[PDB]
Write a protein that binds this ligand. Structure first.
Ligand SMILES: [Ca+2]
Ligand SMILES: [Ca+2]
Ligand SMILES: [Ca+2]
Ligand SMILES: [Ca+2]
Lengths: 327, 328
């Protein structure tokens, strides 16, 4: 188990154990986002598993964030069960607190409230003066959403809180981290986070879908042509044959579903490009219509060129395209 | 749909894929971590998997030691495999480490060798596929196999052990494209529940042979670096550019770095890690008491490289005291 300050990645999740002097702590990393923790007579201790970012993107550019979790939570003293993280420029430490120990944080007068995920959160902004931070000993703002009543399982719509904060004038910088966290202050305790899933993107923005017919897009290359069998669509025959269109992306992540087919029993490949960058390859194994889906594409909001292009043709197959759905 | 058609993606940190050709049906449900359930009915070929896709730039030695710990409820009705699965490119190779199967134990042919590992025995085969579907379209390519001599549906698969066994038998491997725990069906129906599936790249401890290098024994650099005796035998880094460095011979591709140090006062000290001239992370020392800060899972590649510990964020409010660095 982890008993001193450590940063790493475990089963795809970025984890961290942090304490200052005094007392002891133990963190045990389990599968997915899960972990158990125990602490005894600490000054400050933090256990978390989530994602660290490279400090280059806002939370809008990263996309919709949501955490689904469940915890056995037994603090003995001052403690939080909370989503936690940081932004830079401005340097901000933030909290979405769902439960706590003996003291409901953070004191002071709320700047607002948000009703979300079946509860009510009061929103606070505080200041830390010459305190430990990701940038050393520093003075920085703290943003809080604190539930009006305790709960230790459910879904936390992280992006909703970020937008709530920002509308109340609490500017956020580029993201540094988002993680489900157990914090202790001047206390002891144990906790078992048995469920902890951080999801970026694909939430119930996935039940609307935009279908763009291949035959309605702009044709390019030497031979691209319309077809009517095995569906209304286009055929891409040689390298450089392509179909493309400008799309106005409202959100930052999407899945792309191409319905198509090869002309014969050889496997056809169609490349996906956004803004001129390859983002993956659609595969059609045979002559029967099939839908191939490339999920979890981060591309950023705004109007961008979408291309579907054949680059690996060698005269043994053509590609037939019916439509592309963007979710 | 709860994946019922060909799809590639990332879920909870794992690269997942659903692939079938024409005929029959299949359904894959993605659960936490590497886990998923799968069911198929009257298919020609179907594959469900969760693991890691790679960028085709590294050999498996450069990626590092790979090991999968898994458990599955496995109920095939026909020809099927419960297997580690993946690809290399240049050469294009499809590979299998099969722990269980359905009605037919693959792959036929005569074994090229054996390996005893993870408490079982595996026979090793090499076969050829002619104009079959692959990650490079319809192609002709080799297949590498390790197949257990008897079925098992939970345990640990020391993937890198099989890779080295294969290569020593002249089954040369290309740059890695994918490694994943997989359920495959051929001309069959079935269900499976993979309730545990952990892919570990860089995990240790069959020889956890931690190397401690004392800060005072390393090479000093910068304007003020000096020895100290309190709070330990070590060195102090005072200004930007002050550093200590040493050459380390890295046997494996991934390491953990545990730096014992302290600030001189109650302000937080920061020390940067450089390997081979590249910034690889930052150690934090929150106060004046000796503490160990560990940066885990650093991929750095095999070979002799300069390890440097350097202060770059000094502003006159703290110094950094270093006792030793352990590489594990
Ligand atoms: Ca063609
Ligand atoms: Ca169409
Ligand atoms: Ca200094
Ligand atoms: Ca020393």
């Amino acid at each position: 188990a982890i008993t001193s300050n450590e940063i790493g990645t475990h089963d795809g999740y970025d984890y961290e154990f942090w304490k200052d002097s005094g007392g002891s702590g133990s963190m045990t990393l389990n599968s997915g986002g899960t972990f158990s923790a125990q602490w005894s007579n600490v000054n400050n201790i933090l256990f978390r598993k989530g994602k660290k970012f490279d400090e280059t993107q806002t939370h809008q550019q990263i996309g919709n964030m949501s955490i689904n979790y469940g915890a056995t939570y037994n603090p003995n003293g001052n403690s939080y069960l909370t989503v936690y993280g940081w932004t830079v420029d401005p340097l901000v430490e933030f909290y979405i607190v769902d439960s706590w120990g003996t003291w409901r944080p953070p004191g002071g007068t709320p700047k607002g409230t948000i009703n979300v995920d079946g509860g009510t959160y009061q929103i606070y902004e505080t200041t830390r003066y010459n305190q430990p931070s990701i940038k050393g000993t520093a003075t920085f703002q703290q943003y809080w959403s604190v539930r009006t009543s305790k709960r230790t399982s459910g879904t936390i719509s992280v992006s909703e809180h970020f937008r709530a904060w920002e509308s109340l004038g609490m500017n956020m910088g580029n993201m540094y981290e988002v993680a489900l966290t157990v914090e202790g202050y001047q206390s002891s305790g144990s906790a078992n986070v048995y469920s902890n899933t951080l999801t970026i993107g694909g939430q119930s923005g996935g039940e609307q879908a935009t279908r763009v017919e291949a035959e309605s897009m702009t044709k390019g290359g030497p031979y691209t042509s319309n077809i009517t069998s095995p569906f209304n669509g286009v055929a891409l025959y040689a390298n450089g044959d392509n179909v493309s269109f400008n799309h106005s992306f409202t959100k930052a992540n999407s899945s792309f579903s191409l319905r198509g087919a090869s002309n014969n029993s050889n496997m056809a490949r169609v490349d996906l490009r956004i803004g001129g960058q390859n983002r993956g390859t659609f595969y059609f194994g045979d002559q029967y219509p099939a839908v191939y889906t490339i999920n979890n594409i981060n591309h950023g909001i705004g109007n961008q060129l979408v291309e579907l292009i054949v680059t690996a043709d060698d005269g043994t197959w053509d590609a037939y395209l019916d439509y592309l759905e963007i979710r």
